[PDB]
Design a protein around this ligand. Structure first.
Ligand SMILES: NC(=O)c1ccc[n+]([C@@H]2O[C@H](COP(=O)([O-])OP(=O)(O)OC[C@H]3O[C@@H](n4cnc5c(N)ncnc54)[C@H](O)[C@@H]3O)[C@@H](O)[C@H]2O)c1
Lengths: 188, 164, 150, 94, 104, 105, 153, 234, 127, 70, 105
């Protein structure tokens, strides 16, 4: 199973920089598969004229299972950087491949966070996980043990993370510079 | 006026009003819409043992896991009675049943399909009916519980013979 | 229904009860304050949390005056638990006409005001002048030419 | 309204006057009992201390004090004594 | 402030259910109103079961221990009192039964 | 439901929930204050402690401190309770002996 | 009052005032009493839960308020049923003075518990503060007997 | 809700800057004069003389009257479409919507329409901030400043349910300040004289500066140590 | 303005279909015109005693004879649509009875527990 | 959060507007100080472009005062 | 209000001072509560404007030490761009101050 993903992050008009994630499918087969499918984004469903007319709606009208044209909504300097919201760029709703949200209690129990630069599922409830992922920046956050689930770590691109973290924050609560994701894929 | 002659007791109002208990047990019995405090107290007490046990949080109270709804969903209680005259020693295509008033046509057809396996149900004719009233030897008016009459239609006529 | 009942006002003493709510600022009608916490607190716990000097300082009485409402007597010392009326009362007693004359109030001027009609100065800068009430209220105050002398 | 000589009582007809106190700490008859309110022929301090206890109570008196300083309270003030407490010399009856 | 407001709303909805509606634990009106005479009890809860079981025991001889019919001595009045009702303790009753005399 | 409400109250006390989905900020980065516990041999007024521990550079009535709260350990509290119990017993016994031997003397 | 109002409303709406069993049952069912719950008068002019973010400085970096411990301490708590307690700066606590009285008062018509103030025993054993008929402390019989026996009198 | 200032692509950036440099109250008179001249030309071409003529020798007046212009409304298509194509596309370079043309009959409606459009074309506060940010040196000096402003006081306003027509009638009958009512208007600069609040704040700032001088000289710590020694001695 | 839907007020269908009192499930999102308020009791009592008179000339609720019992109505399941006869918007309201799976002990059990003939018409059977 | 988010968004906007007004009043004080120091002290004048702009804006403000007085 | 209210509001020295001295049940009116909330928020705005003016004073006093000589126009432009203050509006404010001083004299 492919355990390596890559993303191209762009800060406003700056050039897209590459960030690389290395995931562990053994300790959490659900979240890793969800993230791999969302980074792949198989949305090549091409329809015809009569097909689109009888369906009355393009299948792209619904939210697509991909991180393409996503944004990093929560960027707090010194702690972490959160992003990956699908349905909207504000970061107020999650969505997984299985449905609205999944749950992995046996994995989230054994999930621990002891390193700088880990990747976890940013969730509101310990059993309500979606597409939003957060990359930790601080030294260690042991208060998240048993609440969120770690699945992978930023292998290459810590400089990219530290550069994204230094964005000024608009009074609206979002980063002043629109930190978005140009492309995202999986490397086998 | 000589007010000093009386003591301090509130006299009964004239004309005195009747107790709020409905004493009519006929065809036109009315359900009282006014809600009493004792009703809420009893509901809460049967729900979570008020006031000894602490109240469950609003989430569990309004969720599908609250004890009354959980028990009604995992251990349903529906009294379905078959009329012996409608299907006894006669090949009838419209057997009738008696159900609680809280059920409907879809409720009854799902009941018969899942519990008793009667899947071929054409149409259920619903008609409410007031509970049976009667007097005992001493003359007390005791009314049986209300029941809803249903007339289910099948594709094939059924009959349960009585071996004479 | 009341989910949270507010504690008694000015419940700062560790051994003695707070003054009545009417004296603190609440509703009158009662002549003694009460505290559920101070009542349920055991006497040994009170004596442990307190000391003799603090006990004396809390038992210090201001008979027959009041500490929180200065200038007037205490509602518990008064016969009725309501505050006195002869001190603060309406400006016109019963059976009395309104024969109050025109009073002149002192006012502090902020600028050298020169009356053009009479040809003189109303008041020099930072001068305390006894002027008409209506004059000060309707003309001097709005233009900020003078402020009330306090 | 003016409630001119209207016998509005709860036990009499179930109606009470619109302008009245819902609670009364002392009935009007208790207020009229001026013998128990004021200090007339009646003791006010019910604590009787020994000789050594009086000397201890007089020890906390600050110097420079005089009985002529404390005036007699008016008739509209209850005559009560809290015993030997802080600032007891301020209380006229104590 | 958001988490605090959520917590306080939860505590509010908890205390509201815990305190409302406030019914008295016990009052003498309960025992005054739930008192029915023997004739009223017999008129309220009677069935032919008692006479039938009397005839049956007279004809058979079987020993019956419990009453065949559940007697509600309140005639439907016990359902009017709240469930958590209990008689308060009355100290120093003005009675002689507590002495337990057996000779007078 | 008892087990569940216990677990849920523990979670709520930990404070891990947040409507914007994501881990909450850490407590150490937020608690920008400190507490100092001083042991005294006798009771001292709170305003006295405030004016004696106040910051001489802060031009505010709180003087760089938020609140001063006095307490007694459970050990000394139980000791005071047992002491007052023994004192009541001693007063009772002394009065009893006095009233018993006043007639023997 | 409410019973007579409901009776008049039902008579004007659905009662034919005949000997029919409908009206015969209404005349007895309308005597039933409805639920009573003291609803505090809401304040649309001033929302107390809105002033939480008032009188607070903010960090220019993150553009969010500063958790001032002095403000959190000196905050005055206003009570309300759906919003059990709400902190508010002490400068604005004056406008919410009536909510304080409505919360301190017992959430029950005074004439339902008026049997308390009409006797000396309850007048001495109960509290009357802002119309709050909450029972004071009262020692048990065992407690008072033990106290008197320890005091040897 | 986030507002974005938009300019129609009909005109170029140069004309956009030229128009936006004009003030609304000042550009209103320019629009008025342009539309007056084109309406006068249309009326002269049609043959109806709107200008006044003295019955003595039938002379023409100076120019049309502003009140006559405000009272003049467009009801014929050959007039309203002409003036629309003349001023909306000619001098302002705007295009009307089909539905909006139903309300564009009135000249006051045309004025309000073009005013709303130029107000929308004008930049917003967020765009002004993005153009001119705050510098680290300014932040540093504002932090070195001892006093800092308090906020959130706008939430203390009495929020009531008021209608626009009710508010207009209130303003017309001067009832904005009657029965304990008021109107909140944010003011950066404040008149400073006879202001008791400002005087108290001046006194507080002076006391703060004196306290800062004391703590810089070291007399504050001296007084604190004297109090400490007194408490240790007594 | 009222809380219950305006089709519940006056049925959207031409024949006044879907008018009257509709009790709703506590967990259901839909609301009904059945309210026990002291101010909502007169109309809800008139709906039972008299009924509603339609413009077409037919009495929809309580046509006559026997008064209905609004407290025992099965919970509301949807809203009436003009295209079909009925549009279901809440499927969780309709209860779905389900039978447990069979097991070695399940097919061995019986209703009553075993503790350690010609029919004759009798007037009374004790047990 | 839906109730509390605009309450802090408005405070953030108000802080930003406060900073902008600070900058504006600072510019005003700069103008006043540079003016009452240049005309007071000697051998201290603005560049040629600055002087021309100041003169033209003075003429514009005088014309505006004439317009508002007429 | 009443005549006694007018007398006491002239005594205590201002309507705002009166409305601030009276609090809670002593001020039973609702017009008074509304006008008191308005006075409170206006006072908060006054304090904010004071802090604003003090910040402006400190900023101009700090940045005047670099444009006091006014020897090099480009140096003055560099000092201005160090903080980011606009130049066209600065010249406009200079001209406004000039016109104001001319009208004063
Ligand atoms: N009209 C009257 O004042 C009146 C009437 C009858 C008797 N007396 C007697 O006159 C004396 C003084 O009266 P007064 O009005 O000046 O003061 P008082 O009686 O009002 O107060 C005297 C104080 O000394 C205490 N006291 C009284 N008798 C005592 C005793 N034998 N030993 C110790 N303490 C005692 C009282 O309890 C009180 O604390 C008292 O003995 C009193 O009983 C007075």
């Amino acid at each position: 199973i492919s355990e390596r993903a890559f993303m191209d992050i762009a800060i406003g008009t700056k050039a897209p920089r590459r960030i690389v994630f290395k995931l562990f499918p053994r300790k959490c087969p659900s979240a890793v598969k969800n993230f791999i499918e969302l980074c792949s984004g198989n949305v090549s469903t091409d329809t015809y004229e009569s097909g689109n007319r009888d369906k009355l709606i393009s299948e792209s009208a619904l939210p697509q299972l991909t991180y393409k044209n996503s944004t990093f909504h929560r960027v707090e300097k010194g702690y972490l950087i959160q992003g990956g919201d699908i349905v909207t760029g504000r970061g107020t709703e999650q969505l997984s491949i299985y449905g609205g949200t999944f749950s992995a209690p046996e994995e989230v129990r054994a999930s621990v966070f002891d390193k700088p630069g880990l990747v976890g599922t940013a969730s509101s409830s310990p059993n309500a996980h979606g597409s939003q992922f957060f990359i930790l920046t601080a030294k260690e956050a042991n208060h998240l043990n048993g609440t969120c689930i770690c699945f992978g770590q930023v292998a290459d691109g810590l400089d990219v993370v530290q550069e994204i973290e230094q964005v000024p924050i608009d009074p609206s609560g979002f980063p002043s510079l629109k930190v978005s994701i140009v492309d995202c894929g999986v490397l086998e | 006026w000589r007010t000093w002659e009386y003591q301090h007791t509130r006299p009964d109002p004239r004309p005195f009003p009747d107790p709020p208990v409905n004493d009519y047990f006929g065809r036109s019995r009315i359900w009282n819409p006014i809600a009493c405090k004792l009703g809420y107290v009893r509901k809460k007490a049967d729900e979570w043992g008020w006031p000894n046990k602490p109240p469950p949080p609003t989430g569990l109270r309004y969720s599908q896991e609250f004890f009354p709804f959980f028990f009604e969903r995992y251990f349903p209680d529906a009294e379905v009675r078959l009329l012996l005259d409608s299907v006894l020693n006669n090949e009838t295509k419209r057997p009738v049943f008696q159900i609680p008033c809280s059920m409907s046509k879809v409720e009854l057809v799902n009941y018969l399909k899942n519990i008793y396996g009667i899947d071929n149900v054409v149409r259920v004719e619903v008609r409410n009916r007031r509970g049976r009233r009667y007097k005992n030897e001493v003359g007390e008016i005791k009314m049986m519980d209300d029941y809803k009459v249903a007339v289910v239609e099948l594709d094939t006529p059924v009959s349960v013979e009585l071996k004479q | 229904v009341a989910p949270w009942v507010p504690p008694p006002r000015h419940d700062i003493k560790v051994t003695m009860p707070p003054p009545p709510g009417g004296e603190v600022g609440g509703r009158f009608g009662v002549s003694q304050g009460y505290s559920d916490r101070l009542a349920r607190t055991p006497y040994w716990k009170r004596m442990a949390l307190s000391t003799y000097k603090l006990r004396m300082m809390e038992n210090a009485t201001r008979y027959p005056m009041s500490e929180h409402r200065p200038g007037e007597y205490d509602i518990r010392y008064l016969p009725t638990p309501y505050p006195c009326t002869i001190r603060n009362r309406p400006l016109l007693e019963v059976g009395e006409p309104r024969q109050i004359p025109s009073i002149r109030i002192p006012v502090i001027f902020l600028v050298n005001l020169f009356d053009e009609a009479k040809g003189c100065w109303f008041g020099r800068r930072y001068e305390t002048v006894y002027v008409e009430r209506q004059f000060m209220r309707e003309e001097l105050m709005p233009q900020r030419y003078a402020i009330y002398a306090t | 309204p003016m409630m001119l000589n209207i016998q509005n009582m709860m036990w009499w007809n179930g109606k009470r006057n619109l302008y009245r106190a819902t609670y009364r700490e002392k009935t009007w008859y208790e207020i009229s009992r001026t013998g128990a309110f004021t200090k007339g022929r009646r003791p006010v301090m019910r604590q009787k201390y020994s000789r050594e206890a009086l000397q201890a109570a007089l020890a906390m008196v600050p110097p420079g004090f005089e009985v002529a300083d404390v005036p007699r309270p008016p008739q509209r003030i209850l005559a009560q004594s809290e015993g030997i407490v802080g600032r007891w010399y301020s209380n006229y009856w104590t | 402030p958001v988490y605090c407001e959520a917590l306080r709303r939860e505590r509010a909805r908890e205390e509201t259910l815990m305190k409302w509606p406030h019914v008295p634990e016990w009052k003498y009106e309960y025992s005054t109103y739930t008192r029915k005479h023997l004739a009223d009890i017999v008129q309220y809860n009677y069935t032919n079961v008692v006479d039938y079981v009397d005839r049956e025991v007279l004809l058979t001889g079987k020993s019956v221990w419990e009453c065949p019919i559940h007697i509600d001595h309140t005639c439907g009045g016990s359902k009017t009192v709240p469930p958590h009702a209990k008689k308060p303790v009355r100290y120093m009753d003005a009675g002689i039964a507590n002495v337990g005399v057996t000779d007078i | 439901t008892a087990r569940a409400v216990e677990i849920f109250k523990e979670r709520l006390k930990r404070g891990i929930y947040r409507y914007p989905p994501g881990p909450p900020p850490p407590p150490g980065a937020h608690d920008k204050t400190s507490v100092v516990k001083v042991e005294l041999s006798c009771y001292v007024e709170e305003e006295r402690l405030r004016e004696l521990f106040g910051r001489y550079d802060v031009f505010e009535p709180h003087k760089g401190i938020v609140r001063v709260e006095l307490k007694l350990p459970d050990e000394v509290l139980k000791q005071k309770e047992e002491a007052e119990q023994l004192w009541t017993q001693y007063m009772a016994e002394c009065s009893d002996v006095k009233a018993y031997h006043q007639w023997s003397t | 009052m409410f019973r007579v109002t409901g009776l008049q409303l039902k008579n004007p709406v659905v009662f034919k005032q005949g000997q029919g069993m409908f009206s015969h049952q209404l005349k007895r069912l309308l005597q039933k009493k409805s639920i009573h719950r003291y609803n505090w008068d809401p304040l649309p002019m001033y929302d107390p839960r809105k002033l939480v973010h008032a009188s607070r400085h903010m960090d220019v970096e993150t553009w969010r308020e500063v958790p001032d411990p002095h403000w959190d301490e000196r905050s005055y708590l206003v009570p309300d049923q759906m919003f059990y307690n709400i902190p508010v700066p002490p400068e604005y606590k004056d406008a919410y003075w009536w909510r304080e009285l409505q919360a301190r008062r017992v959430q029950c018509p005074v004439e339902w518990v008026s049997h308390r103030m009409y006797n000396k025993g309850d007048r001495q054993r109960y509290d009357f503060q802002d119309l709050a008929f909450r029972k004071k402390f009262e020692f048990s019989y065992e407690e008072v007997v033990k106290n008197a026996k320890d005091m040897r009198s | 809700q986030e507002r974005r200032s938009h300019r129609p692509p009909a005109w170029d950036d140069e004309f956009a800057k030229v128009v936006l440099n004009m003030n609304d109250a000042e550009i209103r008179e320019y629009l008025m004069s342009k539309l007056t001249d084109v309406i006068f030309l249309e009326t002269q071409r049609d043959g109806y003389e709107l200008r006044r003529l003295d019955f003595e020798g039938k002379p023409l007046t100076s120019l049309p009257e502003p009140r006559i212009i405000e009272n003049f409304v467009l009801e014929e298509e050959t007039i309203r479409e002409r003036v629309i194509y003349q001023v909306v596309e000619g001098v302002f370079r705007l295009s009307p919507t089909s539905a909006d043309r139903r309300e564009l009959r009135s000249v006051a409606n045309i004025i309000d329409y073009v005013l709303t459009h130029v107000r929308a074309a004008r930049p917003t506060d967020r765009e002004r901030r993005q153009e001119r940010p705050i510098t680290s040196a300014a932040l540093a000096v504002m932090q070195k400043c001892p006093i800092q402003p308090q906020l959130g006081f706008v939430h203390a306003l009495p929020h009531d349910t008021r209608d626009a027509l009710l508010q207009e009638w209130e303003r017309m009958h001067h009832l904005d300040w009657q029965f304990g009512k008021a109107v909140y208007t944010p003011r950066s600069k404040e008149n400073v004289r006879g202001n008791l609040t400002w005087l108290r704040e001046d006194r507080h700032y002076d006391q703060r500066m004196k306290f800062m001088q004391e703590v810089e000289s070291g007399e504050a710590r001296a007084k604190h140590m004297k109090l400490i020694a007194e408490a240790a001695g007594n | 303005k009222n809380s219950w839907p305006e089709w519940m007020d006056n049925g959207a269908d031409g024949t006044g279909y879907g008018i009257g009192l509709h009790r709703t499930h506590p967990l259901s999102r839909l609301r009904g015109n059945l309210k026990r308020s002291p101010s909502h009791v007169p109309r809800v009592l008139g709906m039972m005693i008299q009924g509603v008179w339609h413009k077409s000339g037919v009495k929809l609720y309580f046509r006559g004879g026997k008064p209905p019992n609004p407290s025992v109505h099965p919970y509301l399941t949807g809203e009436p649509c003009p295209l079909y006869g009925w549009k279901v918007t809440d499927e969780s309201v309709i209860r779905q009875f389900n039978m447990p799976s069979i097991d070695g002990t399940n097919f061995r059990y019986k209703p009553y527990v075993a503790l350690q003939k010609p029919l004759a018409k009798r007037l009374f059977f004790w047990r | 959060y839906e109730f509390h988010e605009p309450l802090r968004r408005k405070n953030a906007e108000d802080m930003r507007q406060f900073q902008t007004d600070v900058i504006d009043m600072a510019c005003a004080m700069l103008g006043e100080r540079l003016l009452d120091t240049v005309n007071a002290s000697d051998t201290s004048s603005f560049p040629a472009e600055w002087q021309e702009a100041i003169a033209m804006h003075v003429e514009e403000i005088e014309a505006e005062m004439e317009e508002v007085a007429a | 209000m009443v005549e006694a209210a007018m007398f006491e509001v002239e005594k205590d020295g201002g309507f705002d001072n009166f409305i601030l001295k009276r609090s809670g049940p002593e001020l039973r009116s609702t017009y008074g509560e509304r006008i008191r909330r308005h006075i409170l928020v206006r006072q908060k705005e006054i304090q904010k404007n004071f802090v604003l003016q003090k910040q402006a004073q400190m900023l101009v006093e700090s940045m005047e030490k670099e444009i006091l000589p006014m020897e090099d126009g480009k140096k003055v432009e560099e000092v201005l761009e160090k903080y980011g203050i606009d130049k066209e509006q600065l010249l406009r404010d200079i001209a406004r101050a000039a016109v104001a001083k001319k009208q004063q004299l």
